[PDB]
Design an enzyme around this catalytic site. Structure first.
Site, PDB file in Angstrom:
ATOM      1  N   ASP A 354       1.230  -1.429  -0.149  1.00 43.45           N
ATOM      2  CA  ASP A 354      -0.156  -0.696  -0.192  1.00 43.45           C
ATOM      3  C   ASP A 354       1.141   1.269   0.132  1.00 43.45           C
ATOM      4  O   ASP A 354       1.950   1.125   0.622  1.00 43.45           O
ATOM      5  CB  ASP A 354      -1.279   0.124   1.330  1.00 43.45           C
ATOM      6  CG  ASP A 354      -1.916  -1.207   1.399  1.00 43.45           C
ATOM      7  OD1 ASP A 354      -2.970  -1.014   0.713  1.00 43.45           O
ATOM      8  OD2 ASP A 354      -1.632  -1.784   1.672  1.00 43.45           O
ATOM      9  N   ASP A 706      -3.696  -4.004   6.780  1.00 46.91           N
ATOM     10  CA  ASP A 706      -3.903  -3.682   8.008  1.00 46.91           C
ATOM     11  C   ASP A 706      -5.432  -3.294   8.694  1.00 46.91           C
ATOM     12  O   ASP A 706      -5.297  -2.804   9.608  1.00 46.91           O
ATOM     13  CB  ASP A 706      -2.861  -2.351   8.517  1.00 46.91           C
ATOM     14  CG  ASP A 706      -3.548  -1.277   7.793  1.00 46.91           C
ATOM     15  OD1 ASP A 706      -4.018  -0.827   6.906  1.00 46.91           O
ATOM     16  OD2 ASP A 706      -3.342   0.094   8.441  1.00 46.91           O
ATOM     17  N   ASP A 710      -8.675  -6.508   5.632  1.00 47.83           N
ATOM     18  CA  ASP A 710      -7.948  -7.408   5.123  1.00 47.83           C
ATOM     19  C   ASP A 710      -7.629  -8.206   5.756  1.00 47.83           C
ATOM     20  O   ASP A 710      -7.535  -9.085   4.697  1.00 47.83           O
ATOM     21  CB  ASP A 710      -6.545  -6.149   5.226  1.00 47.83           C
ATOM     22  CG  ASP A 710      -6.503  -4.976   4.890  1.00 47.83           C
ATOM     23  OD1 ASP A 710      -7.012  -4.637   3.499  1.00 47.83           O
ATOM     24  OD2 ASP A 710      -5.592  -3.962   4.488  1.00 47.83           O
TER      25      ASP A 710
END
Ligand code: TM1
Ligand code: MG
Ligand code: MG
Ligand code: NA
EC number: 7.2.2.10
Length: 997
Positions: A354, A706, A710
């Site tokens: 990410d 996170d 997820d």
């Protein structure tokens, strides 16, 4: 009765009573200590494990060890009832077997214990925690779950772990959902209440007013009071049910046991083949001419071989590897939850990271901002600005044209700065300890708080105010002008949020209440019909919109890669009542007919290391996919900027947005994943789907995540990676956790994964090879009739050193050298390659030859040494009987303690050399000098002292049938050993310059 019985069947007061505490204070240092001593720490029993001694005893139970240790007693309780009494050697012989066998267990327990330690200490990097309320202060405290005393007040929010069994006091949220999967077997999150259940003997599925130690908060927040801890935990009274759950063995450990046991087979055959071929020698005069004695002695040779030359603990070596590996990894902020994970990590072929926070710093700040300035049909001028100071601190000026101005002297910037502070949910806070300010809420927004405080659009004072008030100075002031009635927060569908306010000095405010809109520009703009020009409003024409947008693109697409939002208001807000403050879909309805005030543009730079870590990935042949919250334009930009994408490369098809993806058919989606590197504005599902397709190409994939949501995609990934500042619910789903939330760390982890693979290979080569030789030696003396070079006891000593010290010191080898320049390893490839096996024999076999050679030399070519029986050294059993070939050669010479203190004197030194060849898998000793592994080097010297000591302290050599030697003879040892250094060296060179991969 030590435990509070049936809190599930009690009221909140009945629970606040049993212990006696308020949900404002919490347990006082006193009761904390009192319950800590009466109930004990919230943790299982410090289980002992085992004792060294007992474990050693357990090791003494082998077929071979029982057999051998008995087959030596027969040959001793017999060497006493014969004719020719010199009993000392045969007396001490089976005893040395015992002492050596014991010393096996010594290192046995030693290394396993070492492996056990590197296991426990991993947990020290990621302790259990929880939020509590105690009499100390009225603030929220965090502590290790072992520090929670049944009675105190526990706080639980979205993503946390219930650190104990709590009775719910207050459902702080609205709908409380708990992930009880670990206990009740119900994955689907259950709702919770504060009503008292009737039956005290009610099942877990019924006690929906309790939160169990190990369950996970799924949706919402709550407050509660602790009832039981320690072993009385609803989970703790089940953890007695299964203590052993290491059920499963990595395919590598598997493939190894497969091969190694398969070698055990060959080691056994060419063992009772050694004894069997020596049947015509069961009647010799030395054996007292007894078939029984003959079979006894050679049986000792075969079994002794079996016992040493057999692989003592292959699965153990992998373990030694991971233990040691995970230790370095964790030390590098790479906390590896599962063990197999690490093996896998080596084969990582794809990394989905990410952008926000992981690839970038997340040091949110506002770089530039613009507002409309003059509008004249087609003439449209902007007001571009710059705000200095990347910090969260209000320590920067608002430049215009590289000259600082006063934000206040622009009405545009006034309304602007107001929108910011009044669309802000977070704020700042000066910290005294660290001596710096820090965000309090979403960083995106905080950077806005900072901007407002930097702008000071009301000239309010500052220098006379403390660094604590300073932080919320201008902000408070803006609140003084407007009353935040309600808010309509974000929604990825309309991409914005709005607030609603009434003036200050106004009681009957009809046309005085306004609406403040902050959202992504894309959309916010299209719903603007007016443009605020200072304090004015002109109609929002095409050309204006056209320019506004041009700048937004310049910035976002620029070498700044700026995340920018557009701010606007609604001067004609619907009646303070016309709004139904419940339905999201309606909220966009109210956020229309707006005036575009300005556009802020903001930054969160990429971590310094990143560029490099990415370039490295390219080298190691790993793929990198950035998932971001930005539009395709900006995301591609960021990609170019950090090396994911080249400066000029056509990425048209190599980067997608959520939409674009969804607007693709599945057969083409799968197609995308194979070459995608940049994904933008995607949904939590998209991750999982991406993983899916990446699997479909046999990729080993690391997935960062996170969020609670997820967990599925992380779990689906081969290597889930959760952020250290991530939901614990996320971490429970993930294979590895990032202490420092850094993408660069991920990469390092992968590198370490590869290095471990190598070390595993190092410990193996030297093991397997050494032992190969250990056999060929004893097979040669059998295939040539040669007076055996090593006797059972001599062999078991060398072994008891070779696999004792210098072996374990290889667990301290540094990483190789080209480890990252090669492509990722395939989990499909075989453990030991065909070439590697040959390498093993080459060295291994060679060692046997230079072992029988050392003897051969002290006879045939025996320089300045006796024997010198050039030919027919073969048959030596024809000496007492058929001695017409005897010439100045006494028979008792093939029983001289010289060829022994040659073979053995060489083997031990050859193993040292081999230990050095095993520094790098393919890299020369010239590139990897042996002075690299100090510990190993140490082992050599240690071993050398023991060899000397078994030759120079008379008790030893005599009992070991070994006479020391001169320098003129040591030379032969070196001249005979070192050629292995060179042999393996040569081989490595072929592996290097011919079969790189
Ligand atoms: N799936 C998505 N589709 C479209 N936009 C998204 C999506 N996911 C996040 N965003 C927007 O992308 C940003 C995150 O980075 P990341 O770490 O997520 O990759 C997010 O910032 C704001 O809306 C978010 C936001 N917010 O609460 O989340 C509030 C905002 N606000 O009104 O103050 C504005 C957002 N914004 O983007 O402008
Ligand atoms: Mg051995
Ligand atoms: Mg995020
Ligand atoms: Na997983």
């Amino acid at each position: 009765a030590i435990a509070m019985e049936a809190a599930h069947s009690k009221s909140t007061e009945e629970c606040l009573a049993y212990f006696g505490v308020s949900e404002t204070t919490g347990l006082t240092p006193d009761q904390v200590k009192r319950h800590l001593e009466k109930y004990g720490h919230n943790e299982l029993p410090a289980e002992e494990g085992k004792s060294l001694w007992e474990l050693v005893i357990e090791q003494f139970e082998d077929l071979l060890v029982r057999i051998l240790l008995l087959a030596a007693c027969i040959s001793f309780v017999l060497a006493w009832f014969e004719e020719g009494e010199e009993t000392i050697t045969a007396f001490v012989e089976p005893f040395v077997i015992l002492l050596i066998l014991i010393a096996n267990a010594i290192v046995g327990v030693w290394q396993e214990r070492n492996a056990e330690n590197a296991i426990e200490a991993l947990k020290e990097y990621e302790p259990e925690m929880g939020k509590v309320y105690r009499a100390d202060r009225k603030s929220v405290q965090r502590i290790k779950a072992r520090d929670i005393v049944p009675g105190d007040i526990v706080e639980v929010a979205v993503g946390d772990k219930v650190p104990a069994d709590i009775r719910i006091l207050s459902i702080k949220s609205t709908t409380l959902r708990v992930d009880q999967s670990i206990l009740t077997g119900e994955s689907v999150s259950v709702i919770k209440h504060t009503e008292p259940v009737p039956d005290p003997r009610a099942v877990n599925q019924d006690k929906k007013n309790m939160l169990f130690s190990g369950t996970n908060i799924a949706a919402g927040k709550a407050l509660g009071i602790v009832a039981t801890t320690g072993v009385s935990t609803e989970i703790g009274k089940i953890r007695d049910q299964m203590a052993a759950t290491e059920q499963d063995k990595t395919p590598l450990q598997q493939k190894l046991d497969e091969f190694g046991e398969q070698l055990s087979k060959v080691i056994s055959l060419i063992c009772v083949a050694v004894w069997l071929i020596n049947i015509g020698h069961f009647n010799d005069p030395v054996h007292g001419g007894s078939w029984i004695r003959g079979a006894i002695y050679y049986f000792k040779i075969a079994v002794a071989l079996a016992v040493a030359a057999i692989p003592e603990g292959l699965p153990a070596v992998i373990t030694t590897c991971l233990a040691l590996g995970t230790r370095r990894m964790a030390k590098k902020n790479a906390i590896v939850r599962s063990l197999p994970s690490v093996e896998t990590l080596g084969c990582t072929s794809v990394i989905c990271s990410d952008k926000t926070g992981t690839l970038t710093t997340n040091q949110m700040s506002v770089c530039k901002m613009f507002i409309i300035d003059k509008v004249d049909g087609d003439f449209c001028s902007l007001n571009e600005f710059s705000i200095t100071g990347s910090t969260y601190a209000p320590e920067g000026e608002v430049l215009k044209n590289d000259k600082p101005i006063r934000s206040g002297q622009f009405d545009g910037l006034v309304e602007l700065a107001t929108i910011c502070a009044l669309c802000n949910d977070s704020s700042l806070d000066f910290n005294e300890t660290k001596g710096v300010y820090e965000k309090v809420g979403e960083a995106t927004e905080t950077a806005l708080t900072t901007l407002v405080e930097k702008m000071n659009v009301f000239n309010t004072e500052v220098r006379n105010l403390s660094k604590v008030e300073r932080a919320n100075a201008c902000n408070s002031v803006i609140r003084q002008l407007m009353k935040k009635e309600f808010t309509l927060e974000f929604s990825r569908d309309r991409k914005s949020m709005s607030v609603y306010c009434s003036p200050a000095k106004s009681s009957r405010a009809a046309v005085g209440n306004k609406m403040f809109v902050k959202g992504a520009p894309e959309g916010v703009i299209d719903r603007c019909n007016y443009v605020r020009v200072g304090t004015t409003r002109v109609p929002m024409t095409g050309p204006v919109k056209e320019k506004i947008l041009s700048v937004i693109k310049e910035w976002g697409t620029g070498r700044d890669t700026l995340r920018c939002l557009a701010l606007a208001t609604r001067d004609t807000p619907p009646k303070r009542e016309e709004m139904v403050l419940d339905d999201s879909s309606r909220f966009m309805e109210y956020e229309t007919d707006l005036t575009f005030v300005g556009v802020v543009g903001m930054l969160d730079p990429p971590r310094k290391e990143v560029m490099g870590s990415i370039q490295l990935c390219r080298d190691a042949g790993i793929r990198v996919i950035m998932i971001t919250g930005d539009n395709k334009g900006t995301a591609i930009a960021i990609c170019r900027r950090i090396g994911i994408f080249g400066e000029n490369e056509e990425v048209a098809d190599r980067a997608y947005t959520g939409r674009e993806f969804d607007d693709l058919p599945l057969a083409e989606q799968r197609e995308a994943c194979r070459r995608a590197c940049c994904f933008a504005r995607v949904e939590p599902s998209h991750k999982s789907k991406i993983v899916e397709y990446l699997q479909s190409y046999d990729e080993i994939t690391a997935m960062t995540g996170d969020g609670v949501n997820d967990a599925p995609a992380l779990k689906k990934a081969e290597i889930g990676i959760a952020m250290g500042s991530g939901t614990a619910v996320a971490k429970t789903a993930s294979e590895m956790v990032l202490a420092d939330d850094n993408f660069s760390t991920i990469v390092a982890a992968v590198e370490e994964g590869r290095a471990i693979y190598n070390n595993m290979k190092q410990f193996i080569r030297y093991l397997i090879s050494s032992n190969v030789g250990e056999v060929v030696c004893i097979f040669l003396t059998a295939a040539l009739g040669l007076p055996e070079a090593l006797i059972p006891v001599q062999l078991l000593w060398v072994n008891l050193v070779t696999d004792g010290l210098p072996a374990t010191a290889l667990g301290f080898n540094p990483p190789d050298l080209d480890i990252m320049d090669r492509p990722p390893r395939s989990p499909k490839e075989p453990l030991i390659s065909g070439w590697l096996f040959f390498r093993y024999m080459a060295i291994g076999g060679y060692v046997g030859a230079a072992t029988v050679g050392a003897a051969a030399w002290w006879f045939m070519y025996a320089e300045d040494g006796p024997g010198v029986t050039y030919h027919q050294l073969t048959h030596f059993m024809q000496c007492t009987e058929d001695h017409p070939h005897f010439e100045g050669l006494d028979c008792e010479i093939f029983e001289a303690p010289e060829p022994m203190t040659m073979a053995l004197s060489v083997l031990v030194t050859i193993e040292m050399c081999n230990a050095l060849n095993s520094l790098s898998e393919n890299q020369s000793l010239m590139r990897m000098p042996p002075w690299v592994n100090i510990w190993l080097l140490g082992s050599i010297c240690l071993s050398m002292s023991l060899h000397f000591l078994i030759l120079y302290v008379d008790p030893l050599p005599m009992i070991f049938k070994l006479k020391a030697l001169d320098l003129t003879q040591w030379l032969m040892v070196l001249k005979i050993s070192l050629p292995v250094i060179g042999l393996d060296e040569i081989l490595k060179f072929i592996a290097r310059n011919y079969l790189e991969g």
